[PDB]
């Protein structure tokens, strides 16, 4: 039971390939044919088994558990390897030929020995050092030991070398260098000169870069795909290796008998070309060797790589077991940290259980019951390792004495931790361990407040769970990954798992002034929202009509008994009537909750001692962004309290929005006649200002800005007039229609709305621009062919003037499709640039931890940041960037002590 310490790389010597190999291959043949598929070449010449025939190199080795073995090819002529060839040129122009030295004096040898150990740690600093040795050996032609024997200049790109040698007097003939001429030079380098290059004398000899013996990959790495029923598609690596041996074979015969001397060198280059595609097919200056149907061959460098190769495709991202994938559909009746699981997926996924001493009465029943009835088991396991599947014809003989130590695999039950996933996995939080509950249908169910972490919606999406199994990886999932630990987020501190669309706008109808519930409706809703109180709905606060309660005190049963919070929220339309309340509170810390506090407002939330005296709940107490009433309940009253504040609020709030009605018909957008005529005087004079500003430019009354040109000043002034005009008409409609229909309640508080698209539905639609310019593309000086050319008017250059209720006329509709397609392009363009920008930053930064003494360190021990993040508070639990929050502490601690 060892572990991998270190992996050390190098180059295979041709000596070492012979000892590794079991056979030499000389026959370009696969089967030949349809019986006895055994040959003397590339297939199983004691090389590797992929079929169900047991013949191997004497070692049994059926096709399951048979590692392949390596073969070799005795290449008759030496051949330059492709990947090293860029660095062979660095060796050749930095050595003195015919002797083997380094073209340096002993002075620079003795100086630059010492510089290796000083910069003996970092990679980037020693890589820059090896260029200057390459620099100084380049600019010499006179060596200190051979008297300058006319050094030639090498040349490259891609594989063919040359020399600039003189023959008669000053000749410059380019003798092409042969691989046999190169490798004779490389063997003359002594081993001591190798630290002065980037080489190592025991792991990387330079003469081993020239391939004299090419190794053959095994059969198990080159499978044989069967096409229909008996036709075998040959593998792409296999197909090229067959064609390599046929260009070798003749060459052996060619130089042993043939003597024309010309085709030999011509054949020589075919060998080079043919193995060069085999290493890396997509090199430059090389035509791709195609398959004889129209596909290029994916050779070794494309099997290792290529965006779906074998670092991301199969090694660091793998396909898994024990998962499922279906659609999602809401239910607000389960808790925040549970999940629905269908009973079809629940009966095809299993955990192992390992009966010890105290669950032995349980797992006798789970294995006696078969794999049919829902408490059941599938696979039992003895301590030897021979599993016994249960399905077949008896379970009684396995439901005997179960013999403590066994491991039974049973179905998922109510309580076993699962995970969950969304797949685009953007941030830290889109995987979170839930707590399985099993219900019959075909959808994953999911509680509504847990859907800002997943960033999902319910228009047919797909979420995948995957069970963890071993007992160490399962108790890690429950403690570190449950939902309630993730109620606040590490990006901004504020709560993330919080209320959504109905949970906000239901809470406004509960805390309005005038929300008086009768006796049956108070008593019915306290049973539905979880809570357990005894006979105290008391005391019937306003008996003026009938004995019925108020709306504040039904909300003041959910809060703990010693809260004290006061803040102002989004509904504040009169800032003066808040002032009075604020002033009194700050001077008389605890007044009486009866007398003075019934001078209250509907936009100043004030709770003391778990009793909401004055306020109105909107999206400042919940919400996907900051709500400071779920925020101040996780830092003061544990976590497990705040999972049942959010579990009782949610079911209380959807009750009142159900049995009070919240329709929104067509009359919510309707304006009476005199309010419509207020709009038309804005649109007329704003068009008149445009028609005047065209005449100022056309007769030479330019009034220019210094920076911009006359056309760019004109467009500036025009657009401002048009912009302002649409906001001035938006204020007229907004002032008019009251805050008492169910279309502005959704917009002031905030649950899927703005106050823009409710005045973009009974007013203008503004202009219609495209990345800052107004619409200009089209014919020669006129956008549509309904306008006289040479026109810069408002109505004629992209400006609609009718609502989404009063009908768009056909120039306005085609102007509106132009502005709509600019929005849809920027979804699919911007998503692909942000996705690649994330992969850069994760893969550069995933190394950094925090040590026990507060230090962030890289894997090499280089200190990155002392005393983590300007020491030392976690941003997940800090308040708004800052630290210990003295201000809140003072008020909170004093209140409890003084109040008593």
């Amino acid at each position: 039971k060892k572990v991998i310490g270190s992996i050390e790389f190098g180059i295979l010597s041709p000596q070492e390939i012979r000892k590794m190999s079991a056979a030499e291959i000389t026959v370009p043949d696969t089967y030949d044919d349809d019986g006895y598929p055994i040959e003397g070449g590339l297939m199983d010449k004691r090389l590797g088994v992929i079929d169900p025939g047991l013949r191997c190199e004497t070692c049994g080795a059926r096709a399951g558990e048979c590692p392949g073995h390596f073969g070799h090819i005795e290449l008759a002529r030496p051949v330059i390897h492709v990947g090293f060839a860029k660095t062979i040129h660095r060796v050749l122009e930095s050595t003195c030929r015919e002797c083997g030295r380094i073209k340096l004096t002993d002075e620079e040898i003795e100086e630059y020995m010492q510089k290796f150990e000083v910069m003996g740690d970092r990679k980037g600093a020693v890589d820059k050092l090896i260029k200057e040795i390459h620099k100084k050996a380049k600019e010499r032609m006179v060596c200190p030991h051979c008297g300058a024997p006319q050094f030639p200049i090498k040349f490259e790109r891609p594989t063919i070398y040359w020399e600039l040698r003189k023959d008669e007097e000053g000749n410059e003939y380019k003798h092409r260098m042969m691989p046999s001429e190169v490798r004779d030079r490389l063997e003359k380098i002594p081993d001591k000169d190798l630290p002065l290059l980037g080489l190592h004398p025991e792991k990387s000899r330079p003469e081993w870069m020239v391939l004299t013996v090419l190794p053959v990959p095994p059969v198990t790495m080159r499978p044989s795909i069967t096409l229909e029923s008996g036709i075998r598609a040959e593998d792409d690596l296999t197909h090229k290796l067959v064609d390599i041996i046929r260009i070798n074979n003749r060459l052996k015969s060619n130089i042993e008998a043939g003597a024309p001397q010309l085709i030999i060198e011509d054949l020589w280059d075919l060998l080079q070309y043919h193995v060069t595609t085999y290493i890396n097919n997509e090199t430059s200056g090389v035509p791709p060797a195609k398959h004889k149907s129209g596909r290029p061959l994916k050779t070794l460098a494309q099997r290792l790589k290529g965006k779906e190769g074998r670092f991301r495709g199969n090694l660091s991202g793998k396909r898994v077991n024990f998962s499922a994938r279906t659609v999602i559909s809401p239910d607000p009746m389960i808790s925040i940290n549970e999940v629905g699981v269908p009973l079809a997926v629940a009966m095809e996924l299993t955990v192992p259980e390992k009966v010890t001493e105290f669950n032995y009465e349980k797992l006798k029943q789970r294995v006696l019951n078969g794999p049919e009835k829902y408490p059941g088991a599938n696979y039992v396991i003895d301590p030897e390792g021979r599993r016994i599947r249960l399905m077949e014809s008896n379970r009684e003989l396995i439901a005997e004495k179960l013999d403590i130590g066994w491991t039974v695999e049973r179905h998922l039950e109510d309580g076993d931790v699962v995970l969950f996933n969304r797949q685009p996995s953007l941030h830290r939080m889109s995987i979170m361990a839930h707590r399985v509950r099993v219900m019959p249908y075909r959808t994953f169910r999911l509680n509504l407040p847990v859907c800002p972490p997943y960033n999902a919606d319910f228009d047919g999406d797909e979420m995948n769970l995957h069970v963890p199994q071993t007992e160490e990886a399962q108790a890690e999932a429950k403690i570190l990954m449950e939902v309630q630990n993730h109620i606040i987020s590490p990006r901004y501190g504020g709560p993330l798992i919080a209320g959504i669309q109905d949970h906000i706008s239901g809470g406004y109808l509960l805390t309005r002034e005038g929300a008086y519930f009768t006796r049956y409706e108070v008593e019915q809703m306290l049973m539905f929202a979880g809570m357990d109180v005894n006979e105290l709905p008391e005391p019937d606060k306003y008996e003026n009509g009938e004995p019925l309660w108020s709306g504040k005190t039904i909300f003041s049963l959910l809060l703990p008994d010693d809260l004290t919070i006061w803040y102002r929220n989004k509904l504040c339309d009169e800032p003066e009537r808040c002032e009075a309340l604020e002033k009194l509170i700050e001077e008389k810390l605890i007044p009486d909750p009866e007398e003075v506090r019934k001078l209250a407002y509907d936009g100043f939330v004030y709770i003391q001692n778990g009793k909401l005296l004055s306020g109105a709940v909107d999206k400042k107490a919940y919400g996907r962004e900051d709500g400071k009433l779920l925020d101040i309940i996780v830092r003061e009253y544990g976590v497990e309290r705040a999972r049942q504040f959010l579990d009782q609020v949610t079911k209380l709030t959807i009750w009142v929005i159900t049995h009070k009605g919240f329709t929104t018909a067509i009359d919510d957008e309707d304006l009476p006649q005199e309010a419509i005529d207020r709009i038309h005087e804005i649109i007329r004079e704003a068009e008149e200002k445009v028609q005047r500003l065209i005449e100022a430019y056309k007769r030479g009354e330019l009034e220019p800005l210094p920076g911009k040109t006359l056309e760019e000043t004109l467009e500036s002034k025009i657009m401002a007039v048009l912009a302002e005009a649409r906001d001035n008409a938006g204020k007229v409609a907004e002032r008019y229609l009251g805050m008492n229909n169910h279309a502005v309640i959704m917009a002031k508080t905030g649950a899927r709305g703005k106050i823009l698209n409710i005045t973009q539905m009974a007013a203008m639609l503004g202009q219609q621009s495209i990345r800052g310019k107004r619409l200009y593309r089209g014919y020669r000086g006129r956008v549509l062919t309904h306008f006289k050319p040479g026109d810069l008017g408002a109505r004629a250059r992209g400006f609609v003037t009718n609502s989404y209720k009063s009908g768009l006329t056909p120039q306005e509709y085609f102007f509106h499709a132009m502005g709509g397609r600019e929005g849809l392009v920027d979804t699919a363009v911007r998503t692909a640039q942000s996705g690649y920008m994330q992969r850069r930053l994760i893969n550069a930064l995933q190394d950094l931890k925090v040590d026990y003494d507060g230090t962030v360190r890289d894997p090499t021990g280089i200190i990155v940041q002392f005393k983590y993040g300007e020491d030392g508070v976690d941003p997940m639990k800090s308040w708004q960037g800052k630290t210990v929050d003295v201000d809140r502490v003072i008020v909170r601690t004093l209140l409890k002590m003084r109040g008593g």
Binding site: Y779, R780, T785, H786, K788, P810
Partner: protein, 146 residues
């Protein structure tokens, strides 16, 4: 567009006042009649020739896939003729001196079984524009505002 033989068009325009390449200087001669990208021939007055072919097409003598565009820059003048085979066109109704041509008296004929689209393009009231001839047009939207 479907297609038509090109060589018949060369003979038909040459007798209508096209002064060929044998004589042309050309510049600055108020010239440059093209034909499917090829420059052939020259005519003197731009406004005379581009109106002349359109009046013959809306009579029925020449074939129905011919369309003339004019370019009227302050210093440059081109007369374009297009007779290739892969353009995209669009139907409009000819108006003339303020009155929409072929009002109701033909429209009950379309409602009856007398005539059809094969007869209206021969009778000269429907016109298929390119993108290039459509530069010279100025199109209304409703029969109210004409």
């Amino acid at each position: 567009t479907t297609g038509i033989p090109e060589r018949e068009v060369r003979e038909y325009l040459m007798k209508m006042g096209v002064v060929p390449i044998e004589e042309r200087r050309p510049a600055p001669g108020l010239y440059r009649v093209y034909l499917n990208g090829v420059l052939i021939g020259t005519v003197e007055d731009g406004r005379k020739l581009v109106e002349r072919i359109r009046a013959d097409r809306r009579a029925g003598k020449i074939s129905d896939v011919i369309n003339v565009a004019l370019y009227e820059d302050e210093e440059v003048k081109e007369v374009y003729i297009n007779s290739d085979d892969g353009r995209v066109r669009r139907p409009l109704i000819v108006v003339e001196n303020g009155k929409p041509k072929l009002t109701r008296e033909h429209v009950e004929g379309i409602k009856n079984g007398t005539l059809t689209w094969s007869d209206l393009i021969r009778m000269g009231v429907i016109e298929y524009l390119d993108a290039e001839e459509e530069e010279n047009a100025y199109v209304a939207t409703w029969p109210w505002e004409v």
